[PDB]
Symmetry: C4
Subunit: 201 residues, 4 copies
Amino acid sequence: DSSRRQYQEKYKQVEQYMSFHKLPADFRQKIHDYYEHRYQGKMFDEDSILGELNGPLREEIVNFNCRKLVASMPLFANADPNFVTAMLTKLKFEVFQPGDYIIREGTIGKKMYFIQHGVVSVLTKGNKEMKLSDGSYFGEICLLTRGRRTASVRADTYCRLYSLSVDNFNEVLEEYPMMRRAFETVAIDRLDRIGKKNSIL
Amino acid sequence: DSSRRQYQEKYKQVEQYMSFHKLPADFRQKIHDYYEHRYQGKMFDEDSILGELNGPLREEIVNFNCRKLVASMPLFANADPNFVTAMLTKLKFEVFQPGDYIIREGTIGKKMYFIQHGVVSVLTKGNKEMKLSDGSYFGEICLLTRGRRTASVRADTYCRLYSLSVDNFNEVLEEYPMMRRAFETVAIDRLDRIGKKNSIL
Amino acid sequence: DSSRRQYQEKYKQVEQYMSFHKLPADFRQKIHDYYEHRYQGKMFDEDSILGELNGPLREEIVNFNCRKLVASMPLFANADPNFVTAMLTKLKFEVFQPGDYIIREGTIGKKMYFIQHGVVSVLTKGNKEMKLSDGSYFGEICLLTRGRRTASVRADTYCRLYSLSVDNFNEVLEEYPMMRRAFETVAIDRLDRIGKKNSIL
Amino acid sequence: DSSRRQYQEKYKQVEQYMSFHKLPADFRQKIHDYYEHRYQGKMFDEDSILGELNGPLREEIVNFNCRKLVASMPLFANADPNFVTAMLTKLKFEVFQPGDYIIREGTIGKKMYFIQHGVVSVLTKGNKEMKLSDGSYFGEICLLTRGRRTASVRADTYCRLYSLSVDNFNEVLEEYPMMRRAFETVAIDRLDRIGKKNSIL
Ligand SMILES: O=P1(O)OC[C@H]2O[C@@H](n3cnc4cncnc43)[C@H](O)[C@@H]2O1
Ligand SMILES: O=P1(O)OC[C@H]2O[C@@H](n3cnc4cncnc43)[C@H](O)[C@@H]2O1
Ligand SMILES: O=P1(O)OC[C@H]2O[C@@H](n3cnc4cncnc43)[C@H](O)[C@@H]2O1
Ligand SMILES: O=P1(O)OC[C@H]2O[C@@H](n3cnc4cncnc43)[C@H](O)[C@@H]2O1
């Protein structure tokens, strides 16, 4: 009722904004589809809801909502549950559409991404080309090295992702320094399958 | 009327969120009970209300609301009323449920807690085990030493607590340096009843 | 209509909050009176309103609203209008009730106050006692010296004041360093009529 | 419907605010006209709308909305599209009325402005006087030199501008250092047509 009504009302406002700015019909349809994939017909003031709770309830909720994400991703599945919880509570859900450039090579990276569902293409100017899918993650190398993105990453399907900002990534790896090395070893692994090599790792 | 309606409406939204994410029935009931204990059937935009007032009225209100807390806790009861008021105005009310881990040993501490009503268990790996209840406080040692939590603390009953963040704790002990020593002397006292000893105090 | 309704609705919420916390009848009446003096039966989301405007309109409005304040206070009346405008745009309107301690001696000062209407008493432990009224200001010495308040200041009547925070006071005196000396000369003047003397001025 | 209603309701609130503060009839009319020019009968919570989207959609929208601005301004039109997008996503739309002083000489500059539509006068005490119009920009020199504004700039017509804050201007020129030199070369050009000369450029 009230969450469904909230969705309908919020979408009406998006339509009037698009109408105001006279966006073309193909772009409006892409926004409509994004909305349906992202919100699935219900909208919540989530910050407000979880802010009404306490630490333990929020932590229980985020663990329940991400059981699949956690269990299918070896880095999370075998790690200390408190590190997991600390990551989970900082993740932000994002949806991307086919063809979207999630990350552009050469730019400065502010976040990494965990793939809950979807396939992405990792792209470099040197044509060395890979897929990542459910249970994997990407965008981490730049966070480790504070460098520039080492590849472009493009959505091949609709992608349901969870992102983590650089500040949060760093806040969490302070408390649990052991897990930084796990990311590095995979990062090194990945760079060496595309000709790169950082002294920094 | 309007605060009761606000509670009912806000809770409906929590139900639709829980329904959306398909939380199980036991967890929904725990959220329901938390809500009833925490808000007691009325909801307020408190920040907005007190922001409409001035310093003196806010200070009078917070002193009236915490008379019991202040009078039953020797550190507050015998202290300079301006220090009390300065602490009181920074406290945030929190409710925890039986079994909840309020604090985990080894983690980094961002806040301490004053028990208005309830019983908690202080737990260490070395089995040295104590209760704290109404009129006591905990979580202060880490704030004093910027170290890691020296114990776990678990709720035994429903707990009505007031928390104070590390930044506020520090802001207040700047203006009133005399009261830091009162916390330290009890902190030292507490560590020596569990085999620990900090040079820092 | 809508501002009057906003006032009535907001006050109803204050009543239910006071009722919830069981504040006594004398304190509720004091809150009622404060509300009537402060909002005068209409409420506005002012931040939102002025945020909908531009710099020039906001600056024209604040100059029109404070004509009396500006004209009756020699420091503002004879100063560069751009300095005035820059101060005015940072002022926050506050109402205090008789007996209220606006400032306590010994504490750390975060703001100064311009009296639009009312009388206040400047109080020191050494009994040296003065009145300030319409067109005057107070609380400035601490901002100049970053020291501790040199006196207490208490409301004798209902007081309509405009406050300026330490950060804003400093932001403005950067751009217009000439006006700091005007405050200092009056500050020095004031300290020497109560036995104090700062090398800092 | 809902955006038009939002406009009507928001304007009613502006009227009651103006009525409360007893602004004169000429100033009320100027506010009415500003409102009509600025919002054109519809209001949106834009931050909320675009926050509901993702990076790629926001970037597509801002590029579509500013096609004219981009195409008519050589600095944007011939630049790397990613630099353009990065600027565009930080621009804030502003409307000014004839006679408004957008910038005052001598003051400290916090933003620059891109003229989508309108004419402005660049004014200096030394009477050296120029017009800028659609496709041009101004207020950049101070951002480059962190100095004081080198001229006043006044609106001659209704002006539709996009502003960029100093922090954003700097954030963008970090990622794309090549474009700072393009601004400098025009800045130098401009200063030398009014007798000034900065070693800093
Ligand atoms: O540099 P980033 O922050 O942003 C681009 C990302 O692409 C991923 N990547 C790079 N070479 C790869 C080889 N194989 C799989 N994945 C790869 C990796 O997560 C990079 O992190
Ligand atoms: O280390 P913290 O920040 O977080 C865990 C808290 O447990 C409390 N504590 C430790 N030994 C204790 C012995 N007796 C009573 N209370 C005790 C004390 O407040 C600790 O502060
Ligand atoms: O120290 P503050 O920040 O806070 C207390 C204020 O009291 C005012 N004051 C002090 N001696 C005074 C003598 N005469 C008039 N006014 C006086 C002055 O504005 C002080 O600034
Ligand atoms: O100093 P600002 O930050 O603020 C005042 C602005 O006036 C513009 N300006 C100065 N001399 C000019 C000559 N011709 C055209 N435009 C001019 C230029 O953008 C200046 O940047």
